[PDB]
Amino acid sequence: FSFICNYFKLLKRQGPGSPEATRKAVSFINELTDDAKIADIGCGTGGQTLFLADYVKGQITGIDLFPDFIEIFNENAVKANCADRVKGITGSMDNLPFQNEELDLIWSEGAIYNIGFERGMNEWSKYLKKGGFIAVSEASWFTSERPAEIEDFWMDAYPEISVIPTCIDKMERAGYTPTAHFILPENCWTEHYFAPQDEVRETFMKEHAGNKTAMDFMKGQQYERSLYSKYKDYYGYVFYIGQKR
Numbered sequence: 001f002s003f004i005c006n007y008f009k010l011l012k013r014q015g016p017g018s019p020e021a022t023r024k025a026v027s028f029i030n031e032l033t034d035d036a037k038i039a040d041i042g043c044g045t046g047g048q049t050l051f052l053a054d055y056v057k058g059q060i061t062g063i064d065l066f067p068d069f070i071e072i073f074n075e076n077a078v079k080a081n082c083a084d085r086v087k088g089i090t091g092s093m094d095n096l097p098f099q100n101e102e103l104d105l106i107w108s109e110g111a112i113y114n115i116g117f118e119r120g121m122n123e124w125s126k127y128l129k130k131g132g133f134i135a136v137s138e139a140s141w142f143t144s145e146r147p148a149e150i151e152d153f154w155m156d157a158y159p160e161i162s163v164i165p166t167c168i169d170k171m172e173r174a175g176y177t178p179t180a181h182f183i184l185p186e187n188c189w190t191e192h193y194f195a196p197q198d199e200v201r202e203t204f205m206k207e208h209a210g211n212k213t214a215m216d217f218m219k220g221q222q223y224e225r226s227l228y229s230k231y232k233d234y235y236g237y238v239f240y241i242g243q244k245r
């Protein structure tokens with residue numbers, strides 16, 4: 001996970017999503033005030049953080065591991081006239097710089113997988129006020145059994161990938177009222193995640209054409225689309241919205 005970041009820092013989104021998905025997740029939380037405190041964990045370049053910026057009031061704080069991403073985050077915050085309430089800082093997902101019950105809303109798209117769904121649900125709770133909301137998108141199964149090929153890919157990539165019923169079950173455990181959940185539209189993958197990867201494929205494939213590692217990675221990125229186009233009926237990203245009791 002080194003040069004890879006120099007690939008993703010180009011893209012406007014490092015994970016599947018769309019302005020519609022973020023906006024729909026927002027429709028399930030309570031209205032916020034300019035004095036609210038928001039946190040987008042695993043924000044990345046901040047592609048979805050800015051969408052969220054137009055959908056809710058409050059001070060948003062994006063947190064990512066890689067400083068190169070955070071660097072672009074603020075770059076965009078300033079180019080959007082909202083550097084005042086939209087600020088990105090480098091940090092970790094398993095050790096957040098938040099006081100207990102300081103946050104009104106915890107956001108996270110295609111990043112919870114880094115520390116485990118259940119673990120994140122419980123560990124992040126601490127930082128949320130009573131009645132506060134948490135909204136995260138996560139890859140999940142849509143059926144009870146799927147094809148071998150696709151099953152392998154995930155069980156190896158992310159072992160905690162479970163069916164939707166199981167995730168919601170983990171939400172109650174962590175003390176969350178399972179407000180809602182919805183599968184992410186197919187365009188979130190193809191239009192907003194894959195299609196943009198073609199805009200920067202050639203410029204890239206040139207700089208690393210002779211590198212074995214870089215090639216196996218590129219083939220990996222192309223293998224994901226192949227898998228999605230072939231098993232878009234068995235898995236995908238699911239948005240989970242809950243309210244801390």
Ligand SMILES: C[S@@+](CC[C@H](N)C(=O)[O-])C[C@H]1O[C@@H](n2cnc3c(N)ncnc32)[C@H](O)[C@@H]1O
Nearest residue numbers: 013014015042043044064065092093109110111
């Ligand atoms: C799939 S990307 C999604 C980025 C952004 N949420 C989006 O949807 O466009 C995963 C993000 O999690 C970040 N990340 C990985 N490990 C992390 C950690 N330990 N703490 C915080 N962020 C982390 C990665 O750097 C990356 O920005």
